[PDB]
Each structure stands twice: as structure tokens, then as C-alpha cells.
Amino acid sequence: DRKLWAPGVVAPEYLKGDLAGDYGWDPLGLGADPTALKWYRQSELQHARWAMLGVAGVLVQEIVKPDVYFYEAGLPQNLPEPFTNINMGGLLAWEFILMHWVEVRRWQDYKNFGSVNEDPIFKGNKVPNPEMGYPGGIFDPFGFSKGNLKELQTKEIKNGRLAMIAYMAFILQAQATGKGPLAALSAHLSNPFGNNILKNIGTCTVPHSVDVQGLTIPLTCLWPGSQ
Amino acid sequence: VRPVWFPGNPPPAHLDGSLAGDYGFDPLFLGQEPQTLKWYVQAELVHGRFAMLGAAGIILTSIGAKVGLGFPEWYDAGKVVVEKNNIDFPTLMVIQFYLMGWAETKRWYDFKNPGSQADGSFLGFTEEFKGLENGYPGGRFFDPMGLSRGDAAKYQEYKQKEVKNGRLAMIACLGFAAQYAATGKGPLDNLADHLADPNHVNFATNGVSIPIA
């Protein structure tokens, strides 16, 4: 909680540094309810980890194959050769079921903390739980914990906040200039005064709709302007 | 203390946090008298249950007409029903009023006399018609699953859910009426027109709702 988010601000009396990355920000007072603070920490960890994976994926996907737009990589006709033009219904089914399982397990760990630790088939195997949101065990196989856990949680959540900001940046850049992260960076370095957020905000390069094997996904932008 | 319709405003004394869906909304003080408040409670529940049935039926038949099944819109189904089936509308209306009059007079005279309707006069049915609470008859006929019986907190949660979905369905039926009067088409036609272009297709772009432009 020390070294807060601003020089002259005070921390709310529910943010006292017991959570990692606590700068005492909470300007909307959403974490004033401890129940809601627990749930929002879990959602923060989820958004953070998914966004770290997301920026890693967009970056490594542009580096490995710059041939493919990450904004259009979800389209089935841009999928790799073992999966090109695959039926998105069965794909969505795989994803839906396999994610329903794990996310309901995580949610039951939130509701009753320490109740879904054991494997339900091979009932000899229990994931530990130092904290809610940090299962460990098979999720910490290299064992980087049982050391500086608070410092590693701080690193995780800081890089995760940064990755959330960075992925929304990726998305908005892809919507504005129609380019990936590194493509946008190189386009800035090519002409860093005629190619910036000016002369590119106000134009959305996302189409009004996209036909995906019969469906028409509505395909909006995060702000209005130019199709 | 308790959620109010107008945060900050204290609730009126006659709206204690006891009835289902009590948010202290009585600006005209219509239910200030207790017996009048019981009457209006049963009126709200009957209105909301009829409106839940009506919204569900309108929604289902609109779904059927929208996906292509053999369904008219809610504003055309009476004519279609009495003309597809050679049904005499007077006969249907008087049968409906006979049956609903029996039912609603039983309602009325259980409200006037709660101890009534359970003497065995109807067909020997005594306890099926005694009524649990005002507006919540219960029993083996009106509550065949026994959901009022057993768990009481579940029963209160269900009362809240009932009154709230009933108010939402009353608003929804008012919306169906206004949307037919404005757009001249079905409810889910309105919804599809809104989901097509959420902007430029709403009540501000009919020329009926806002006559300024």
C-alpha cells in the first residue's frame, strides 16, 4: 500500500497492502464491500492472466507469421492447415464444454474456498490453495512459489495490468489503423508525425458485419466513425 | 436500511418492508388504508400474473411467427383463431365470463371472508380453497408442488420474484401495446429491427413517440 498511485492521496481503509499491487486506488469505491473486493480481485486476476496470454499470443503470432491479421485470425478460413475451414460449431462446442468445466470449478473454489481441490476421478490428488486465485500444485509445477510469493504476486498483477492496457491498445489500434501491434509500431517509426493516433482515430477499419460459415457476426468497433 | 424506488426518500409508513416487492413507491398514497392496501396487493398480483402469462404467450407466438411457424401476431390471433376454427366469438366470450366469474367471485368472497370457500360447498373441497395469504391462495390445487410449503425463505424469495417479474411483464405488455400503436408490427419484429440498427431504429425514430423530430 506504500507508494500509492498519486503523491497526495490517501488509501481507503479497506486497502491496507494485504493484496499484491495495492496502490490504494479505488476511486469508484467498488472494493468497499469485502465480498465484492474478493470477487473483483478474482476478476482482476482472470482479466490479467488472459490479457498476458493475449498480448503474448498476438505478439508471437505476428512474429512467427506476420501473414495473418490477429483481428481476423479467429476467422475459420485463416486457420492453420490442420484446422482451415473447420466447423466453428464443433470448435465452439469443444471450447464451451472444456471451459465450462474449469471455470465452474474455479467458481466453486470462489464460493466454497478449498472444496474443489481434489481430483474428482482420481481421488488421491489435491491441489493446494495458499490464496484464492493461486491454486498451485499442478498449476505451479516448476515450484516458483514456496519462496517470495507476495513479490511474485506483485510482479504477476503488475505485468497483468500492463498487459490489459496493452491488449486494449492492440484492439483499438487494429480497429483504427487496421494493423497489428508491431505493424502499427513500424508504421509509426516509418512516419512518426503523419501516422499516429491523430489522422487514425475517427476511422474504424472493422467491417459492419462478417459472414462466418453462414452466420453474420455484427462486428462493432469500440467507438464511432467511418464504417 | 431497505432499497427504495427513490434513493434518499424515506418510505411511507404504510409500506413496511413486509409485502413482496416493497420499495416504498406510493407517491399518490393510494394504499394508505390497510384494507385498500390488501385489495391493491391482490390486484397487483392478479394483474402481474395475467401479464406474465400474456407476455409469455405474446413472446412465444412472436418467436413462432418470426421463425416461420404457423402463427399470427398477438394483435391478429383472436380473429385468426375464431375464423380458422369456426368459433362464435359471443359464445366464447360468455363461456370465458362464466368460468372467470366463478373463479373471480370465489376470489372476491375469500377476500371479503378469508375463512370462506373452505366449508365444502363447492364440491366438498375444503382445504384446497382456504387460502394461505392474501393474494397467495396455495393449497393442493393452486400450489400443487408445495413450494409455499416447506422452505419459508424460498417462499419469500419466490414471492419477490413473482411480484417483480409481474411488474416487468406489466411493463412489457404496455410496451407491446405502445409498440403496436407506434410501429404497427410485432414485438420481435421491433426487436429484430432494433438489433439490426440499434441507432436510427428506436422510439426516437418513429415520428410517433417524439413528434419534435
Add this chain to the structure above:
Amino acid sequence: SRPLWLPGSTPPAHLKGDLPGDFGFDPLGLGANAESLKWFKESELVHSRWAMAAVAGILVQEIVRPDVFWYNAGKEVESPLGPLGLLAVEFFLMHWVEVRRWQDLRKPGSVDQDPIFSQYKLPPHEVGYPGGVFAPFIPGDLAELKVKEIKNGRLAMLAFVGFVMAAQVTGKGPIAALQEHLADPWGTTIFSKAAVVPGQAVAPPCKIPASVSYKGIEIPTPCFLQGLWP
């Protein structure tokens, strides 16, 4: 304590685990009333048993006679006993047995006695589990077998519902649709036949006709809840 449907949840106060198949599942609290719970227990048992017999029947009918669709098997038998003679026999026999079962449901100590040969009767049993002449060669403990019965029966209830909804969407029987799924796992799901988005809705059309003749009439043959289909 006991295995639950949600390994972290708390079962309702009215589900103490005494009953077979009691896994704490009553999110709506339908079995909260002690009197409604007996009726729902019996209805679960008879639904389970009817659905198990019916699923086994469709499967074995599909294996023995793949020539006939189980959804159409009502109008394709052409027995010499006509439709209405069979319907009358079934009506009266099922009326007898179901009224007997119902009389055991209401007043349990009522009907264990044979109404013809007084020497034969059922031993004092539990409602839903007659026993006696209904149960020769019970193989093992009765409690675990009641649990097995109700579990296979819930599975068979879902299996008959699946037969219905995969015979209305696919028009094929259970094993035929299973082979249809094995021959195209990613394209023959219901997710790959149907999808609704905010702006369009693609539903699978029924392979069942809306009406069938059956001897001079027209039986309405509707899809279950089409329109609500995804």
C-alpha cells in the same frame, strides 16, 4: 459428507441424504414439502423405469429392426389387432395397474393382497419398491441397487429426451445419429447445425413431417418446441 452434484455446495435442508440418488440437487426446492417429496420420489422412480425400458427398447428395436424409425414405429406396425383394440387393452390394463400403484402411493398399507388368490400378497414394503413377486433374485445389497436403479434411470430419462430431440433434428435413430456423429464429430453437433446471434437465428429444420395419415385420419406430428429451437 456424501457426494453432491456440486462438490462444494451445501444441500438443501430438506435433502438429508436418506433417499437413493440423494445428491443434494433441488435448486428450486420442489421437494421441500414432505408430502410432495413422496409423490416426486414415486414419479422419479416410474419415469426412470419407463425411460429405461424405453431407451433399451429403442436401441434393441434399432439393432434388430433398423428397417423402421422408432419415431415412426407407431404407424408402421400394422398388427392384426387394429389400433383401437390394442388401445382398449392397454387402457384397461394400465388403468388397473396404475390405479393399484396409486392406491399404494396414497394409503401405503392398502394394496399388498391379491384380489383373486388371497394366499398370495406382498410383504410390507416401501412405496415405489413393491418387492415380493415383483423382485425375485435381488443380486446384492438393496440400497446400492436402488442407487444404481435411480442413476441409470436419470441417465435413461435424459437418453430418451436425447432420442426425441436427435430424432426431430436429425430424423435418425439413436445409433444412426451416433454413427452420424462419429463420421463427422465437429460438424454434426447441435452447435454445428444451429446458432443464434444478435441479428440472425439459424435453427435446424425438423425431419419429422407435421402430419401423418395412419388409416384415414391425420395425426398431428409436431416438433417438440420448435421456434425455441436454437
